[PDB]
PDB file of C-alpha atoms in Angstrom:
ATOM      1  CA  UNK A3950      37.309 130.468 181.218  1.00  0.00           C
ATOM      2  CA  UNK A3951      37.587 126.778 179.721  1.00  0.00           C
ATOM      3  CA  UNK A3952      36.113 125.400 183.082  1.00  0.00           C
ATOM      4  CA  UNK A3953      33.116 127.970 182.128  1.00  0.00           C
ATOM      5  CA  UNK A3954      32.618 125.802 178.716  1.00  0.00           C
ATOM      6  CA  UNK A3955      33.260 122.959 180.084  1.00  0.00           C
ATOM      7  CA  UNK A3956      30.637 123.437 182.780  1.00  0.00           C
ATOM      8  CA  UNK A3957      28.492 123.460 179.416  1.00  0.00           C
ATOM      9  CA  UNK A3958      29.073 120.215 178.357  1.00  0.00           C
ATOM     10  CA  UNK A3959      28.447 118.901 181.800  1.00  0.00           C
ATOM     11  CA  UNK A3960      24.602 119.928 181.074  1.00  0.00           C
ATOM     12  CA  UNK A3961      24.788 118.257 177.618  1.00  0.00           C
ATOM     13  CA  UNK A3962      25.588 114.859 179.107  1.00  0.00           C
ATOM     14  CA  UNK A3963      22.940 114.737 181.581  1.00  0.00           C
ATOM     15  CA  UNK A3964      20.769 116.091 179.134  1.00  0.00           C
ATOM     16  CA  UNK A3965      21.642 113.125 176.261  1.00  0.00           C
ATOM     17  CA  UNK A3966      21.210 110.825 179.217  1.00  0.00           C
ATOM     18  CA  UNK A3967      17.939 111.518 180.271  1.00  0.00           C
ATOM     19  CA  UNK A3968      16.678 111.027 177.076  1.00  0.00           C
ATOM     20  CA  UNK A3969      17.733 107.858 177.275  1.00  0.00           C
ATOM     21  CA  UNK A3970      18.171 107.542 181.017  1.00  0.00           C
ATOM     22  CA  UNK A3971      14.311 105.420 180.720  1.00  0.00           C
ATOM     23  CA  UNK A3972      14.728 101.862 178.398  1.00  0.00           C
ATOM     24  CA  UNK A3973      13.869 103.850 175.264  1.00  0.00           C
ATOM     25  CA  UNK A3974      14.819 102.209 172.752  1.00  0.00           C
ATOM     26  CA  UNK A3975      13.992 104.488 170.097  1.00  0.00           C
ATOM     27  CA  UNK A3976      16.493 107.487 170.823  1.00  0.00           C
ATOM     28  CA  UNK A3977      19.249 104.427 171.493  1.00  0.00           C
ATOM     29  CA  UNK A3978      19.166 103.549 168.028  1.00  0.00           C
ATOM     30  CA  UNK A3979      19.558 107.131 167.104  1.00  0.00           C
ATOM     31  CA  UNK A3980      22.019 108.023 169.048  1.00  0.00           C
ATOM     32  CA  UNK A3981      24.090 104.173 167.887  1.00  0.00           C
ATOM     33  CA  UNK A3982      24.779 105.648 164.424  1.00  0.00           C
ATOM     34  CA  UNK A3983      24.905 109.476 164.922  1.00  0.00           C
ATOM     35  CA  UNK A3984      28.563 111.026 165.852  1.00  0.00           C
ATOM     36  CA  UNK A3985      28.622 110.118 168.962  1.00  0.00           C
ATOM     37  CA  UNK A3986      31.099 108.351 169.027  1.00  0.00           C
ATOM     38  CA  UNK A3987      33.551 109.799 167.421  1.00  0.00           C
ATOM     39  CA  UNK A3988      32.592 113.434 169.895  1.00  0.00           C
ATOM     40  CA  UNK A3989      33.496 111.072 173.022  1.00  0.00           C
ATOM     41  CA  UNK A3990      36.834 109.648 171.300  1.00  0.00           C
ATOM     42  CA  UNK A3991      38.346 113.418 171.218  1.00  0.00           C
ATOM     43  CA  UNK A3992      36.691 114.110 174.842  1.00  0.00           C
ATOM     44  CA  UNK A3993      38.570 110.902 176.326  1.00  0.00           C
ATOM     45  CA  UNK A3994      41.707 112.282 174.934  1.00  0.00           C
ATOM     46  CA  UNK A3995      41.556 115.617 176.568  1.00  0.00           C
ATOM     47  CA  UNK A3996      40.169 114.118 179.645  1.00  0.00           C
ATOM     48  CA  UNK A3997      43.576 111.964 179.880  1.00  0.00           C
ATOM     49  CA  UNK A3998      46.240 115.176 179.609  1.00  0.00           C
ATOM     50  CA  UNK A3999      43.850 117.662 181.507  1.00  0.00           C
ATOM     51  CA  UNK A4000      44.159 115.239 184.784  1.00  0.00           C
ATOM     52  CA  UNK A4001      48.002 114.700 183.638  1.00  0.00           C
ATOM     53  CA  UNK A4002      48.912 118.735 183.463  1.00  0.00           C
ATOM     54  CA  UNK A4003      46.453 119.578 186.776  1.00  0.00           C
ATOM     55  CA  UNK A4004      48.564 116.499 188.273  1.00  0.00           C
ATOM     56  CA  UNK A4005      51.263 117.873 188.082  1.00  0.00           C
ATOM     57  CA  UNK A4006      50.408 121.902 189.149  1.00  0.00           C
ATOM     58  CA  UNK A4007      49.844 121.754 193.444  1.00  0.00           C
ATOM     59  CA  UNK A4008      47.526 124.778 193.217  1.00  0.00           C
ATOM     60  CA  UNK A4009      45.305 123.006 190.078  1.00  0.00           C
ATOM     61  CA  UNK A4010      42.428 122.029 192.310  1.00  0.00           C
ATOM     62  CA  UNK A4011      39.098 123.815 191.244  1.00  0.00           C
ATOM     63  CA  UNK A4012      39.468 123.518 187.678  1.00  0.00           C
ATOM     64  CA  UNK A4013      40.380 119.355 188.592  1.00  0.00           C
ATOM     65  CA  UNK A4014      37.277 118.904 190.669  1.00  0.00           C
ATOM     66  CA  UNK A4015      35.252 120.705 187.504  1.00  0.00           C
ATOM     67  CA  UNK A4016      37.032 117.885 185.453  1.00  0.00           C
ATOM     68  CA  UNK A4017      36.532 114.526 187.480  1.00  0.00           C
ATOM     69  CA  UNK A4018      32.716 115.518 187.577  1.00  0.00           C
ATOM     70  CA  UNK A4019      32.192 115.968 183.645  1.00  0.00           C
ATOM     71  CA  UNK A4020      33.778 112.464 182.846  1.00  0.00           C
ATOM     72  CA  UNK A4021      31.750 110.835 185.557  1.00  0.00           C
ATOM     73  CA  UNK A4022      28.261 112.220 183.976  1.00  0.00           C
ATOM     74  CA  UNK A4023      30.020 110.935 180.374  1.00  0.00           C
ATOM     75  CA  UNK A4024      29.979 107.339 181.618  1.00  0.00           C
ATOM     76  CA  UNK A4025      26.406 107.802 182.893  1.00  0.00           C
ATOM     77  CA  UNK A4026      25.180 108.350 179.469  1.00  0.00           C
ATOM     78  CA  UNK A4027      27.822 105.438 178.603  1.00  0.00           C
ATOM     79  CA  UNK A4028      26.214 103.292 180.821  1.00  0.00           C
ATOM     80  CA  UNK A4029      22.370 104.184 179.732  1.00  0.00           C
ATOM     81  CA  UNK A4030      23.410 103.072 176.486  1.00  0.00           C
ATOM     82  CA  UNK A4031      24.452 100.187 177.709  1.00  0.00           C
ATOM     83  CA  UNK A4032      21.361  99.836 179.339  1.00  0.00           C
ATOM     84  CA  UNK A4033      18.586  96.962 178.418  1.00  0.00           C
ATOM     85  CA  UNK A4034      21.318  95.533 175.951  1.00  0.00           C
ATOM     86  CA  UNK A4035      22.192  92.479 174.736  1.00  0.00           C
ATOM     87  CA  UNK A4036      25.154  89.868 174.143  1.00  0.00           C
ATOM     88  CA  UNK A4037      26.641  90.576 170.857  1.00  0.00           C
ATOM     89  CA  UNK A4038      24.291  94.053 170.662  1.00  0.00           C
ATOM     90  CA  UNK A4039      24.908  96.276 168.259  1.00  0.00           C
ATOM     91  CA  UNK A4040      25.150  99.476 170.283  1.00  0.00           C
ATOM     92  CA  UNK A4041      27.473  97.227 172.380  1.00  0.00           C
ATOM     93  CA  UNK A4042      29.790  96.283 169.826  1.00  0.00           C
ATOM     94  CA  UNK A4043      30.124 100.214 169.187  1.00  0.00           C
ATOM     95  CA  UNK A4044      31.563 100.753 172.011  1.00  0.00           C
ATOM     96  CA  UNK A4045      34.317  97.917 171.039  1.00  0.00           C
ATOM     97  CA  UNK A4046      34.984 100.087 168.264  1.00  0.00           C
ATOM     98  CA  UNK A4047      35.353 103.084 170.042  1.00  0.00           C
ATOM     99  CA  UNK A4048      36.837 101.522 172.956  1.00  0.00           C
ATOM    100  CA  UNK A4049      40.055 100.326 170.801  1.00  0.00           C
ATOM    101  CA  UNK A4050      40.591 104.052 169.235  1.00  0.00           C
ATOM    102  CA  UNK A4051      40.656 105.363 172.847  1.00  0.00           C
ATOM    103  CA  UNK A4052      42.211 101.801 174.488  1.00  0.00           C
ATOM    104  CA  UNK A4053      45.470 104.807 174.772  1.00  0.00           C
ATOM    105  CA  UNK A4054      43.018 107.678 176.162  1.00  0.00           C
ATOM    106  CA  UNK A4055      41.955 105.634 179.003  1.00  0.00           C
ATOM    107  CA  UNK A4056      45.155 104.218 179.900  1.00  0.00           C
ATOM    108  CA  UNK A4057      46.632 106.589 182.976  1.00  0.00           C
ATOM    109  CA  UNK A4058      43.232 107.168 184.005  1.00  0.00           C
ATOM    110  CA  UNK A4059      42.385 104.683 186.450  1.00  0.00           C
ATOM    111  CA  UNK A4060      45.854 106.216 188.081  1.00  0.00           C
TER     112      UNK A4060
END
């Protein structure tokens, strides 16, 4: 059911990153001032109670492997935007912006 959709937007990620995956500069500075940003603010914060509620639930295992992959292609696509930046970059500092909306999300993560 959700892990169905979800599987979805595990397609999507890969898909935005290999448009980007290569030091193309052009789609980067799209994608810097579309909505991206704020569509990965409200995934981070259902990433953070989804591993919370499957935590807790012992037989919650094949929907929580479905999760911990989608997150891991996110950052992937995080981390090709990050790639061929620069010190004070813009696309860089748009991540500090994001990053402090979501400093809460990804708190109880790295646990």
């Amino acid at each position: 059911n959700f892990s169905k959709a979800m599987s979805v937007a595990k397609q999507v990620f890969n898909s935005l990153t290999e448009y980007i995956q290569g030091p193309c500069t052009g789609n980067q500075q799209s994608l810097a001032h579309s909505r991206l940003w704020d569509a990965v603010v409200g995934f981070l914060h259902v990433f953070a109670h989804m591993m919370m509620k499957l935590a807790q639930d012992s037989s919650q295992i094949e929907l929580l492997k479905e999760l911990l992959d989608l997150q891991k292609d996110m950052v992937v696509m995080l981390l090709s935007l990050l790639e061929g930046n620069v010190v004070n970059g813009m696309i860089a500092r748009q991540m500090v912006d994001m990053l402090v909306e979501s400093s809460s999300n990804v708190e109880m993560i790295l646990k």
